Scaffold this active site. Structure first.
Site, PDB file in Angstrom:
ATOM      1  N   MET A   1      -1.770  -6.044  -2.219  1.00  0.00           N
ATOM      2  CA  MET A   1      -1.952  -4.905  -1.242  1.00  0.00           C
ATOM      3  C   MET A   1      -0.830  -4.060  -1.515  1.00  0.00           C
ATOM      4  O   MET A   1      -0.342  -3.310  -0.511  1.00  0.00           O
ATOM      5  CB  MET A   1      -2.241  -5.036   0.059  1.00  0.00           C
ATOM      6  CG  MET A   1      -3.614  -5.659   0.296  1.00  0.00           C
ATOM      7  SD  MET A   1      -4.913  -4.427  -0.203  1.00  0.00           S
ATOM      8  CE  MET A   1      -5.254  -3.373   1.109  1.00  0.00           C
ATOM      9  N   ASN A   2      -0.429  -3.867  -2.533  1.00  0.00           N
ATOM     10  CA  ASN A   2       1.112  -3.264  -3.087  1.00  0.00           C
ATOM     11  C   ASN A   2       0.877  -3.114  -4.307  1.00  0.00           C
ATOM     12  O   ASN A   2       1.799  -3.542  -5.312  1.00  0.00           O
ATOM     13  CB  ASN A   2       2.145  -3.965  -2.514  1.00  0.00           C
ATOM     14  CG  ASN A   2       3.406  -3.042  -2.910  1.00  0.00           C
ATOM     15  OD1 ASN A   2       3.495  -1.882  -2.724  1.00  0.00           O
ATOM     16  ND2 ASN A   2       4.594  -3.994  -3.322  1.00  0.00           N
TER      17      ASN A   2
ATOM     18  N   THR B   1       0.766  -1.004  -0.140  1.00  0.00           N
ATOM     19  CA  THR B   1      -0.055   0.020  -0.258  1.00  0.00           C
ATOM     20  C   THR B   1       0.863   1.290  -0.014  1.00  0.00           C
ATOM     21  O   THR B   1       1.595   1.497   0.831  1.00  0.00           O
ATOM     22  CB  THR B   1      -0.993   0.017   1.395  1.00  0.00           C
ATOM     23  OG1 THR B   1      -2.157  -0.969   0.942  1.00  0.00           O
ATOM     24  CG2 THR B   1      -1.426   1.612   1.428  1.00  0.00           C
ATOM     25  N   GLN B   2       0.605   1.974  -1.008  1.00  0.00           N
ATOM     26  CA  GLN B   2       1.448   3.250  -1.249  1.00  0.00           C
ATOM     27  C   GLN B   2       0.779   4.514  -1.591  1.00  0.00           C
ATOM     28  O   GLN B   2      -0.578   4.519  -1.297  1.00  0.00           O
ATOM     29  CB  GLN B   2       2.363   2.921  -2.296  1.00  0.00           C
ATOM     30  CG  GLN B   2       2.057   2.086  -3.347  1.00  0.00           C
ATOM     31  CD  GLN B   2       3.116   1.911  -4.496  1.00  0.00           C
ATOM     32  OE1 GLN B   2       3.570   2.831  -5.082  1.00  0.00           O
ATOM     33  NE2 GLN B   2       3.211   0.874  -5.116  1.00  0.00           N
TER      34      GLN B   2
END
Ligand SMILES: COc1cc(/C=C/CCCN2CCCN(CCC/C=C/c3cc(OC)c(OC)c(OC)c3)CC2)cc(OC)c1OC
Ligand SMILES: COc1cc(/C=C\CCCN2CCCN(CCC/C=C/c3cc(OC)c(OC)c(OC)c3)CC2)cc(OC)c1OC
Ligand SMILES: COc1cc(/C=C\CCCN2CCCN(CCC/C=C/c3cc(OC)c(OC)c(OC)c3)CC2)cc(OC)c1OC
Lengths: 233, 222, 196, 204, 249, 222, 233, 196
Positions: free
Chosen positions: G107-108, G1-2
């Protein structure tokens, strides 16, 4: 309930054998942007009192107006407006300390720290502090912001206690203040080189110095400093 | 919602799509979003509908009351100042987003008002969910010195871009033409390009289909 | 902090203020932000000092190992090791790095690596918090293929403005000159650059 | 916590040829708990009909209030209020509470005693007016109601045809709604007379 | 500031009269004559535009005022009291009617509302009664055409035709013997033109006479088209050229 | 922060006939108020006379469709090219879905074909694998608009025999594929009038003993 | 997550009778700062495929080199990498799509929106879109960001249904794209005047135009606009 | 927003960009941020457009009333009215205003009233989001008592730079010249100042 926007940094001060010196730099910061450089944060009230101010600059400007008006109105129906009934430093301070406290007590403060410097009509030195919380105190040295961390320890070496005040001349006390101002310019990131200083002496009166610069700076040793631990070139 | 305003050589025209939406439900397939403030000052509204009508009628009422007092035809700049000072007071809580156009003794005017109270001047404007699709068109085909017929077409294509390409907008195009020396012209359903096709079946029921427990006359007279 | 690297005829010059700050307190007023990762490959660091010292230390290690195996690395390769570390660890770094160096094939080169881990080859590069204030100045004053003296002045002036306005910047202006002649370290003190 | 959905309930109104119909379920619940099977949501003031879905306390309050206002209207104007005018009265009374509104969804139905023209209208909780010549729906099963009506509806249906349509639309929609049901009522209204039938429905 | 008159200025005398109301009434009697007539298909109200100096401007002297696009009013008595009353009247038609029901008040209701304002001035602390009487002519959809008189007492009554001010008694007598319940609008205008003649001492033309009709809908006076359900105002003020034109009779 | 899910709109419908089955969806693909495509099929032939739709979050929908197609092919590989009967495919799909019980496939899934007796079959799924065989099922945006209609016009609910007055339920004689299709079309046109997500086009897949047939009809484009 | 740092705005594109067009401006913004003006955001892969990328520019550069690796690896043990077993637009798409949905599922995400444009070997036009969620779709016109809202309506006026494509010429197609790029420049606060455009035609192959400028802008009427309501001067 | 006011030989000039945004959408590309409050007293608007318009509207009124009663107001008087509004309503306003005026006694004057309510009198002032990028340039390039064509050029260059870097600035450059001679409106288009 608010937050400061345009701000002024340390106000420093001490008392010597025949009066008080107070100083403050000429900077109005806007967060980290050093926005305004011709900002006078020392405010002389008549000729026996200087009030130095840090914090929100709009609030300072307001207090400034309150002080001219305090002077205008002291004159009204007072033929002794420049004699036995001139504004005394203790009068101005008690006034100020009163407004700060009411303002905090309405949960809408003036975002400031104030030092009121002067000589009382009996010759006594006046030096007292007040801030946005309405908190007040006195000491032979007083400073706000970074000044209370860096300036006080230096100034306190000249005047540790009460008995040191008579032994402290105006030459010694002024030098201490100019030194402290340089230290502040070394270490406080919201400071400026240009500052103002004021002496309130019980014989020579109010002397107000402006456009001073921090001089005699040691930066040369920096050439011999390279890398951050392991580098050699 | 998609609303536009286009000034032309001797007047001003505003247009609006016809669709009203509760979330993703179409509540009214055909509502008019074009409001009269005074006989020759019209308004297009997008946002909270209740606020769009309530603010439009209050100012409309006052504009009338004020022209009766002053014995002058109402000015567009007065609707504008009264709208803006009212919206501003309410700090955005009145969700009113307006394109207000009209003709008066001073000429032809086109303004827009946002809910918070800010106003803008232009020769062409749009508002609402369809705002960007409409503007895309306006921005591509607009030119100074349009005829009335060109500005109607131009305004009407802008609403169209919103109808087709915006899910918040659809059905019909309403237009209002306020020219300088004549009556305001209010063309309700000037375009009706979304007519429902015939259904495959008829869902009319046999009589008595429904089960009834009690039958009774209601008294509506004194 | 205020950092830049500028390419010119003979090579490339890196510059920086010397102020690191913890809040409003100036933790260090004689910081060296010009950092050697190879003989003629240097970097300007900004962001977390810890993140940025650690990255430089790893890059120094990599190019040293590179060197003993494949000889001298290109400036472009130095930039790549940096990007790789910054991009793949983007969630746990606050680093903004300008990489600059010299080849005889390539002359002066400048790569900027911002918070992305994106990498950008530029004729010059500004960065750090003080940088915002001199965007306009530098765009009006950069010329390609300046002389060494011209370039040292262009940096002197830009950085003195950045220091002037940004309180996060200050102290001395440091430079490092990268030419075929080699490696020259310059310093400029307050009393000099203030009155410009 | 969503005031419009504590109590449940629906109302639908349609127009036909020289007639209109208005119908509601009979449920009053406290969330999952059914409380009453006799909470009618349709009221009349003269020949004008008002349906109110939403929070039950406000439904009751609003009905008492338009009683009070339409009574005063009669005493002064010496006539009965007409559906068009009453719609406006509803709209403006709701907007008076723009910043603490009643959590309701009114529906108006009636025949204009002078023009004979059939009229229906709907509002949101702050008074925006939806006037349409086909149907108006309100309540916890409003999407169901929308789906039914859009399919079941023809224009110009005779009263007894219209009755079949409106009933089937209400009934079948309440059945896909956990918060509606427990009985239904249908009013068929003509300028001449008004008939009120209770419907037989599942009680679960 | 410091309005200390919270007590009433109109009291009952021992005879049972309300003095100030009688006196106000008296000020009306000495006012210029104005009249109204109800025809089958319209109403006319009329008055004299008595110019003080001929340097004064005729148009500037309005005595006939639109209240609602279907309601007009005219008066006899103190003109400033009237001007004020007109503006309260227009505002109240919006404030207690248009902004609540979305339509303009029926003519009797607007009248009872002007009546209310006037009554209060005969009772509220610190004020005197208004020194005017109004004739108010209108058309709403459920009562059709109507004509009312409102007095400084707050009382009002509907009339087939009436007149107030100086020449009222002569005018009322003349009106009584010319009014039938089958006049067209046009006839009643002619009769109004006749009745005014007697009361008008001097010059009698379209620039010394004011006339209004509450009649047919003027979709020419709407200002916009496109909503067929919205027709023009029924109120129309006649032009001097219009009056003069049929003064040939 | 990063939210791994989205909504792409769409509405799907499956009716199980007697010797047939249909599975239809609109062909519109949306994001918020924007249209991504007016033609982007959502109902797929998977082989073994099985059609499938996975509606909701579109990326998740395609992942699921792809995995299932793969499951069919691998089932052939592992079981001597045996036909994956609809009930087995349904159980297979429960497991595909439940496998992600803690990072669900944000979709509502329907499959259609013929059971082992040749009868029409429709299966409907949770986002996490719960399932049932069903007579008919709508899923997605307009499902609440269509479901009550199908209750009425397909199961003859709340309809009673004229004259018996709710004593005899109207008998549910079942329907040709041609009638079922009219019902599907009228459901969708009703859907696209009142829902901003439904529109553009209607693709219907028809399953018979003779295999899979496809039909397309345009819908309103606003 | 970014969270994205350096960004590129719209990529817009459509297909005409013989191929596709795709356009993208040459800018990488750093929030409100218009930081980099040389950014090429159209990535050609082979000569039947251009890949336009909006979103985070560090993630784009990563994707960009994935594409080169993909061309290198295709040519390994492949005597047909220059015909028949050369990279096809749909292959390059399915790969990207696969990576995007996989990163989302970890999730990235690769914080981007991609449009893949080209002509397949058989001759068919390829135009498809994938984003940081792995969502995919095709339409005769396609666009990311503002382009979705402002470009698509203009472009759909030319190609509104599939049957319009064999009717639309390259000149007409290319016209629309250029006008759209100008409208975007008028109304997108993160956009740039300079842009790149690529045409992949089934008979002319890949045509890649760099350093185009927005021309023919209407600004003149700005002189007549005074005040925001009542001001006349 | 990018705005500035600069005092020169024969008075003062105001400059603004013409772009108003909500998010990344340019809601208006031809905005007029230069606002008349008296014949020879104008202001520059930055911050909330609602707040800033509402405040100017009020000041204009206050100065129109002042005029009726006491004759023409000084540029400092106009500043005090802006200040009073801004400081007293600081919780509910988001406005940075520059106040500029000509008057024969003291020629051109520039005041800045930033967020909060402070008031600063200066030779020139810059404000708006675009302003951060041109601080270095404006400081290097300002000199007092410039000619009227030098002051137009100084403002044209600063603003073009501001616009180049700030995405929330753009469009045309508007100027207003306040001179003893009267009031002049200038406009510069992109195809002119972009080439600078
Ligand atoms: C010189 O050394 C220093 C370095 C730093 C650290 C510098 C790093 C800055 C950090 N950021 C600023 C740069 C910008 N930023 C993100 C941009 C904000 C815009 C929101 C946005 C979100 C999106 O996500 C959906 C977008 O995509 C559509 C988008 O479009 C561009 C915009 C966040 C992070 C700080 C210092 O003290 C003041 C300092 O002085 C000693
Ligand atoms: C059916 O009617 C509708 C209603 C609505 C809902 C209301 C619309 C909202 C309008 N806006 C959208 C949201 C964006 N916006 C303003 C943005 C927020 C301002 C707050 C803010 C304040 C600050 O203090 C000054 C900030 O500075 C710290 C700040 O950050 C930069 C942000 C303005 C306008 C939307 C619709 O479109 C689909 C619609 O259909 C036409
Ligand atoms: C799009 O960008 C904009 C936004 C806005 C609206 C929001 C902007 C807010 C910016 N702030 C700058 C000012 C700083 N700030 C908070 C911090 C205040 C400093 C506290 C402080 C107190 C002290 O003693 C009391 C200090 O001295 C010891 C001190 O040292 C700095 C600092 C928050 C707010 C306004 C703009 O121009 C009018 C604008 O264009 C550039």
């Amino acid at each position: 309930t608010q937050q400061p926007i345009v701000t002024g940094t340390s106000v420093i001060s001490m008392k010597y054998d025949n009066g008080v010196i107070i100083a403050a730099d000429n900077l109005g910061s806007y967060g980290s942007l050093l926005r305004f450089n011709g900002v006078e944060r020392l405010i002389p009230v008549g000729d026996n009192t200087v009030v130095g101010i840090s914090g929100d600059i709009s609030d300072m400007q307001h207090i400034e107006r309150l002080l001219k008006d305090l002077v205008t109105e002291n004159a009204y129906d007072n033929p002794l407006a420049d004699a036995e009934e001139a504004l005394e430093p203790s009068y101005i301070f008690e006034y100020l300390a009163t407004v700060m406290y009411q303002r905090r007590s309405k949960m809408n403060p003036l975002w400031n720290a104030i030092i009121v410097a002067g000589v009382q009509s009996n010759g006594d030195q006046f030096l007292r502090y007040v801030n946005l919380l309405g908190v007040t105190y006195s000491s032979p040295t007083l400073a706000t912001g970074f000044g209370a961390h860096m300036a006080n320890p230096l100034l306190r070496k000249v005047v540790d206690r009460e008995s040191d005040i008579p032994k402290t001349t105006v030459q010694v006390a002024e030098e201490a203040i100019v030194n402290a101002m340089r230290v502040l310019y070394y270490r406080d990131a919201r400071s400026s080189r240009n500052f103002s200083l004021a002496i309130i002496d019980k014989n020579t009166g109010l002397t107000f110095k402006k456009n001073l610069q921090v001089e005699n700076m040691k930066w040369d040793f920096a050439k011999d400093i390279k890398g951050y631990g392991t580098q050699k070139i | 919602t998609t609303i536009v305003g286009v000034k032309f050589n001797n007047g001003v025209v505003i247009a609006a799509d016809t669709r009203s939406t509760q979330g993703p439900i179409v509540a009214d397939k055909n509502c008019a979003k074009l409001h009269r403030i005074s006989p020759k000052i019209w308004c297009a509204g997008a946002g909270t509908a209740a606020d769009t009508e309530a603010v439009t009628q209050l100012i409309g009422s006052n504009i009338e009351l004020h022209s009766l007092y002053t014995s002058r035809e109402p000015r567009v700049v007065s609707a504008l100042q009264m709208l803006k000072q009212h919206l501003f007071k309410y700090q955005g809580h009145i969700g009113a987003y307006l394109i207000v156009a009209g003709v008066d003794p001073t000429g032809s005017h086109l303004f827009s008002i946002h809910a918070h109270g800010s106003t803008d001047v232009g020769y062409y404007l749009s508002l609402g969910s369809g705002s960007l699709a409409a503007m895309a068109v306006l921005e591509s085909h607009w030119k100074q010195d349009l005829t009335k017929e060109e500005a109607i077409k131009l305004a009407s294509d802008a609403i169209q871009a919103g109808i087709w390409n915006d899910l918040g907008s659809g059905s019909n195009v309403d237009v209002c033409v306020m020219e300088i020396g004549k009556d305001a012209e209010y063309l309700r359903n000037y375009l009706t390009p979304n007519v429902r096709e015939e259904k495959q079946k008829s869902y009319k029921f046999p009589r008595g289909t429904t089960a009834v427990l009690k039958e009774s006359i209601v008294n509506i007279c004194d | 902090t205020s950092i830049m690297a500028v390419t010119f005829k003979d090579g490339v010059i890196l510059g920086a203020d010397s102020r690191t700050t913890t809040g409003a307190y100036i933790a260090n007023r004689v910081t060296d932000k010009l950092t050697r990762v190879h003989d003629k490959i240097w970097c300007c660091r900004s962001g977390s000092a810890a993140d940025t010292q650690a990255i430089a230390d790893i890059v120094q290690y990599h190019l040293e190992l590179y060197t003993s195996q494949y000889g001298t690395p290109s400036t472009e390769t130095a930039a790549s090791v940096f990007k790789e570390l910054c991009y793949e660890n983007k969630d746990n770094l606050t680093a903004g790095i300008i990489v600059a160096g010299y080849d005889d094939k390539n002359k002066g080169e400048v790569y900027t690596i911002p918070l992305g881990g994106s990498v950008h080859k530029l004729p010059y590069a500004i960065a750090g918090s003080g940088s915002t204030f001199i965007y306009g100045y530098c765009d009006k004053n950069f010329r390609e293929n300046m002389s060494k003296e011209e370039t040292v002045d262009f940096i002197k002036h830009s950085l003195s403005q950045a220091i002037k306005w940004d309180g996060s910047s200050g102290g001395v202006i440091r430079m490092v000159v990268l030419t075929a002649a080699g490696v020259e370290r310059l310093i400029f003190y307050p009393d000099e650059y203030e009155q410009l | 916590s969503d005031p419009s959905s504590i109590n449940g309930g629906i109302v639908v109104a349609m127009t036909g040829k020289d007639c209109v119909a208005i119908a509601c379920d009979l449920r009053l619940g406290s969330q999952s708990l059914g409380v009453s099977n006799k909470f009618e949501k349709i009221f009349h003031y003269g020949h004008v009909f008002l349906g109110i879905t939403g929070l039950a306390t406000d439904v009751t309050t609003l009905n008492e209030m338009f009683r009070y206002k339409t009574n005063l209207y009669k005493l002064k104007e010496e006539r009965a209020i007409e559906p068009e005018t009453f719609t406006q009265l509803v709209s403006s009374s709701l907007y008076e509470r723009r910043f603490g509104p009643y959590f309701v969804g009114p529906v108006v139905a009636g025949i204009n005693s002078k023009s004979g023209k059939p009229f229906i209208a709907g509002f949101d909780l702050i008074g925006c007016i939806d006037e349409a010549k086909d149907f108006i729906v309100s309540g916890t099963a409003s999407d169901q109601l929308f789906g039914m009506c859009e399919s079941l509806y023809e224009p110009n249906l005779e009263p007894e045809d219209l009755f079949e349509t409106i009933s089937q639309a209400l009934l079948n929609a309440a059945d896909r709604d956990a918060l509606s049901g427990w009985g239904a009522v249908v009013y068929i209204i003509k300028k001449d007379e008004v008939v009120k039938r209770y419907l037989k429905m599942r009680q679960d | 500031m410091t309005d200390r008159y919270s007590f009433s200025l109109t009291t009952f005398s021992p005879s049972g009269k309300l003095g100030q109301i009688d006196y106000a009434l008296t000020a009306v009697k000495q006012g210029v004559t104005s009249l109204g007539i109800k025809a089958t298909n319209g109403v006319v109200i009329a008055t004299e535009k008595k110019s003080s100096s001929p340097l004064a401007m005729s148009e500037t002297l309005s005595k006939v005022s639109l209240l609602t696009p279907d309601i007009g009013a005219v008066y006899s008595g103190m003109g400033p009291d009237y001007r004020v009353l007109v503006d309260k009247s227009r505002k109240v038609a919006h404030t207690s009617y248009k902004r609540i029901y979305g339509e303009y008040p029926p003519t009797k209701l607007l009248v009872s509302e002007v009546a209310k304002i006037m009554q209060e001035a005969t009772q509220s602390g610190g004020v005197r009664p208004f020194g005017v009487s109004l004739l108010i002519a209108g058309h709403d959809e459920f009562n059709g055409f109507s004509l009312y008189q409102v007095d400084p007492s707050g009382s009002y009554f509907p009339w087939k035709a009436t007149a107030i001010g100086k020449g009222s008694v002569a005018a009322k007598t003349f009106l009584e013997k010319r009014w039938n319940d089958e006049l067209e609008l046009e006839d009643a205008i002619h009769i109004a033109l006749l009745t005014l003649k007697e009361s008008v001492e001097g010059e009698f033309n379209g620039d010394t006479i004011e006339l209004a009709i509450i009649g047919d809908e003027n979709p020419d006076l709407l200002g916009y088209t496109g909503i067929p359900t919205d027709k023009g105002p029924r109120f129309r003020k006649l032009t001097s050229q219009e009056i003069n034109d049929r003064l040939e009779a | 922060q990063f939210n791994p899910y989205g909504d792409n709109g769409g509405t799907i419908l499956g009716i199980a006939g007697e010797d047939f089955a249909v599975l239809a969806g609109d062909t519109r693909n949306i994001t918020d108020y924007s249209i991504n495509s007016r033609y982007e099929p959502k109902v797929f032939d998977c082989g073994d006379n099985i059609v499938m739709s996975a509606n909701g979050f579109a990326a998740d929908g395609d992942a699921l469709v792809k995995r299932f197609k793969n499951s069919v092919k691998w089932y052939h590989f592992d079981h001597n090219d045996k036909k994956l009967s609809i009930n087995s495919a349904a159980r297979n799909i429960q497991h595909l879905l439940y496998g992600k019980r803690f990072f669900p496939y944000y979709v509502h899934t329907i499959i259609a074909g013929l059971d082992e007796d040749g009868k029409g079959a429709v299966y409907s799924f949770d986002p996490v694998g719960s399932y049932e065989r069903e007579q008919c099922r709508a899923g997605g945006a307009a499902a609440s608009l269509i479901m009550p209609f199908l209750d009425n016009q397909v199961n003859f609910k709340n309809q009673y025999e004229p004259g018996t007055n709710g004593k005899v339920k109207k008998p549910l004689k079942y329907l040709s594929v041609e009638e079922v299709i009219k019902l599907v079309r009228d459901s969708f046109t009703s859907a696209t009038e009142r829902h901003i997500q439904v529109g553009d086009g209607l693709e219907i897949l028809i399953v018979t003993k003779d295999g899979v047939r496809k039909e397309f009809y345009e819908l309103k484009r606003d």
